[PDB]
Amino acid sequence: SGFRKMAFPSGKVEGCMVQVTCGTTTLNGLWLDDVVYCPRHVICTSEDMLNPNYEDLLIRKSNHNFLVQAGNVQLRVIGHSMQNCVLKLKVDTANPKTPKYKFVRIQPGQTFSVLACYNGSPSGVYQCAMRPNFTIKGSFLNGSCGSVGFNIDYDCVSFCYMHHMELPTGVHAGTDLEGNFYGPFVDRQTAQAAGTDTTITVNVLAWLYAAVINGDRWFLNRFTTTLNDFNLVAMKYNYEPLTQDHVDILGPLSAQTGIAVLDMCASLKELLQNGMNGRTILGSALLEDEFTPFDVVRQCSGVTF
C-alpha cells in the first residue's frame, strides 16, 4: 500500500556523469562507451548566447580546448562533432561503468527520473513529466545544464532528456540525447516563453485508478459519459483532450478495478465541478497528473483493495 512519486534508482546514471569545461563555462556531460554528450552551448560565452553561430564557434576549437573530468581523473578528448544541439566528445577511454542503454525521444505526458548534477557530481534525484507545452517543471540551479532524464524499465537505461535552459516562468527546456529540442525552443538567450500549459488527462485518470486500487472510492458516481461530452467539459478546465488511444491504454486498469474508462471519466468531470470538499485522494488535495498508466501498474498492487 501507499503511493509515492517514485524515481528509478540512479546508480546506473551516476556512473556516467562527468564535468565538461570550455574556457570559462563548466557544465555536465554524459559519458557512455568512449563518447561524452553535453549541451553544445558549453562553447558559448555569455556574449555569444543571443545569436550564437555554433558551427563558427566550433570550427575554432581543437580537441584539447575541451576539459573533461570524471571523478578525479582528466579524460583525453580525441575527437568532436555536433549533432543538432548536442556536442559529442570522443574520448580515449571507454566508461567501464557504461550500463546497457538506449536513446529514446518521449511524448508529452511521459514521465522520467532526473538526476540533477553540478560540476559532474550528482546532487539529487526526482521524478517529473514532459508537460503538454514541452517544458518540464524541474528543480535546477545554474550549473545544472547537461543533467539527464531517464527511465530504467528492467536493467536497460533509456535516456530521454538532457537539460539546456530555464525559461522566465521558472520552468525548464531541453533536448533528447540526439540534440533535438522538445518544444519550439532554441538554445539562444532570445525572448522565449512557455505556451499555456494544460493538465495531462490520461495521467489524472490513471492516478484515480491508483486511488481505487489502494482502497478509495469516495469520488466515484453512478454516471457515465461519451468521449466527446467528456472532452467538451474537460477542455473548459484546461485539460488535454482524451483520445481513443488513451481510452485503450487505460483498459488494463479498467479491467483490474471493474470501473469502465468512461465511468472514470464521469467521476473526473464531477471532481472538476465540485472540488474535493475537504477530502484528499492519495494524500493530495489537487488532481495529480505526473503518473502515467504504466507508472500506476508498475507501482500499485495487482490485487485491488
Ligand X SMILES: CNC(=O)CN1C[C@@H](C(=O)Nc2cncc3ccc(NS(C)(=O)=O)cc23)c2cc(Cl)ccc2C1=O
Catalytic residues: 41, 145
Q: Does 73 bind ligand X (CB under 6 A)?
A: no
- 258 makes contact, choosing from ligand X, a second copy, Cl ion, none, with CB < 5 to 8 Å by partner type, with none
Q: Rounded to the nearest 10 degrees, how much is the dihedral formed by the CA atoms of 183, 184, 185, 190?
A: -160
Q: Report the C-alpha gap between 134 and 143 in whole angstroms.
A: 22
Q: Does 107 bind Cl ion (CB under 5 A)?
A: yes
| CA dihedral for 103, 239, 242, 219, sign (positive or negative) | positive
Size, binding site for ligand X by CB under 6 A: 13
Which residue, chain included where needed, has cell 465541478?
A: 273
Size, binding site for Cl ion by CB under 5 A: 3
What would the x/- binding string for a second copy be over residues 278 to 297, using CB under 8 A?
Answer: --x--xxxx-----------
Contact with ligand X (CB under 6 A) among 12, 131, 164, 269: 164
- Which listed range, 45-53, 131-139, 239-247, 260-268, lies at the site for a second copy (CB under 8 A)? 131-139
- 14 makes contact, choosing from a second copy, ligand X, Cl ion, none, with CB < 5 to 8 Å by partner type, with a second copy
Quick one: DSSP state of residue 54? H
Nearest to a second copy of 172, 246 (CB atom): 172
Q: Does 110 bind Cl ion (CB under 5 A)?
A: yes
Beta strands in 119-208 (DSSP E): 121-129, 148-151, 156-166, 172-175
Beta pairing class for 156-166 and 100-103:
parallel
| CA dihedral for 192, 131, 231, 204, sign (positive or negative) | negative
Nearest to ligand X of 177, 233 (CB atom): 177
Q: Three-state SS for 12?
A: helix
Q: Cβ distance 202 to 132 under 8 Å?
A: no
Which residue, chain included where needed, has cell 495531462?
A: 200
Contact with a second copy (CB under 8 A) among 64, 79, 126, 162: 126
Residues 6+ positions from 245 with CB-CB distance below 8 Å? none
What would the x/- binding string for ligand X be over residues 213 to 232, using CB under 6 A?
Answer: --------------------
146 burial (CB, 10 Å; 0-12 / 13-18 / 19+) is buried
Q: Three-state SS for 285?
A: coil
- 189 makes contact, choosing from a second copy, Cl ion, ligand X, none, with CB < 5 to 8 Å by partner type, with ligand X
Which 132-161 residues touch ligand X, going by CB under 6 A?
140-142, 144-145
Instruction: Output the smallest distance, CB 249 to Cl ion, in A.
Output: 11
Q: Does 4 bind a second copy (CB under 8 A)?
A: yes
Residues 6+ positions from 92 with CB-CB distance below 8 Å? 34, 75, 76, 77, 78
Nearest to ligand X of 268, 300 (CB atom): 300
Which 16-55 residues touch ligand X, going by CB under 6 A?
41
Q: Give the footprint of Cl ion on this chain (CB under 5 A).
A: 106-107, 110
Q: Give the footprint of ligand X on this chain (CB under 6 A).
A: 1, 41, 140-142, 144-145, 164-166, 187-189
Q: Give the footprint of a second copy on this chain (CB under 8 A).
A: 1-12, 14-15, 115-119, 121-126, 128, 137-141, 143-144, 166, 170-172, 214-215, 280, 283-286, 299-305
